[PDB]
Amino acid sequence: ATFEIVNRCSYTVWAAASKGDAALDAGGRQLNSGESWTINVEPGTNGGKIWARTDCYFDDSGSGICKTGDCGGLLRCKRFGRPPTTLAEFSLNQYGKDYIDISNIKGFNVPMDFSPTTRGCRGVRCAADIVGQCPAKLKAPGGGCNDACTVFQTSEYCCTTGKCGPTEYSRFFKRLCPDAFSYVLDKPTTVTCPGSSNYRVTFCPTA
């Protein structure tokens, strides 16, 4: 499956794509304002994620650092990135169907639209200004808006026991972006698409 990843932000981002234990495609690449990068993801990819990283420096070998979303200092990500990171999440060809969603469970750094480019389902979007409205205690000094698990490390915020409920913090995410996961047990906003759909992930989809 192809995912066109498009940076409509006014700033450079370094796109990243991983399924946690491996890169997807090259795993990462710089996208200046306006650029598009098309990757190929193997059918049957389960638990895939795509995200943006900000204010990165890499050297000639592709080692460095990112202020949000750093995946162990690599340009070419093999593992998930350091919160805060708005996440495009997907599992492909799962008993005949694709599943897509956007999640704020690991915080928010960059607005995002995640849409099929092929027929038969809708896209999802989290494009509100969550960084500028972020509650004081969630603001990440390095840039972006942390989820409350990252900040406070409690069973309630992290949903460790499997029994958590919504919180003042999760409700800020949900109010700003009703169509993204705000906490682990949030009512699902996952979209069911035809198996083997193709997709576009757009950073900063709106002015």
- Compute the distance between CA of residue 91 and CA of residue 105 in angstroms, rounded to an integer: 17
Q: Which residues, 6 or more positions from 117, have their beta carbon under 8 angstroms from its beta carbon?
A: 2, 4, 197, 198, 199, 200
- Compute the distance between CA of residue 176 and CA of residue 106 in angstroms, rounded to an integer: 15
Relative to beta strand 87-94, strand 191-194 is unpaired
Structure determination method: X-ray
| Distances in whole angstroms, Cα of residue 115 to Cα of each of 95, 118, 131, 136, 150 | 21, 9, 22, 32, 28
Which value, to the nearest 10 degrees, does the dihedral of the CA atoms of residues 60, 63, 68, 70 take? 140
| Distances in whole angstroms, Cα of residue 175 to Cα of each of 77, 104, 131, 143 | 31, 12, 13, 21
Q: Which two tokens stand for residue 118?
A: 């092929």
Whether the CB-CB separation of 7 and 15 falls below 8 Å is answered with yes
Q: Amino acid letter at 38? A: T
- Compute the distance between CA of residue 89 and CA of residue 12 in angstroms, rounded to an integer: 22
| DSSP collapsed to 3 states, the chain | CEEEEEECCCCCEEEEEECCCCEEEEEEEEECCCCEEEEECCCCCCCEEEEEEEEEEECCCCEEEEEECCCCCECCCCCCCCCCCCEEEEEEEECCEEEEEEECCCCECCCEEEEECCCCCCCEEECCCHHHHCCHHHECCCCCECCHHHHHCCHHHHCCCCCCCCCHHHHHHHHHCCCCECCCCCCCCCEEEECCCCEEEEECCCC
Q: Which residues, 6 or more positions from 103, have their beta carbon under 8 angstroms from its beta carbon?
A: 86, 87, 89, 180, 181
25: left (phi over 0), alpha (psi -120 to 50) or beta: left
Rg over CA atoms, the chain: 16
- Compute the distance between CA of residue 114 and CA of residue 5 in angstroms, rounded to an integer: 9
Widest pairwise Cα distance in the chain: 46
Q: Which domains does the chain have, with CATH numbers?
A: 1-207 (2.60.110.10)
Q: Which two tokens stand for residue 180?
A: 């993204």
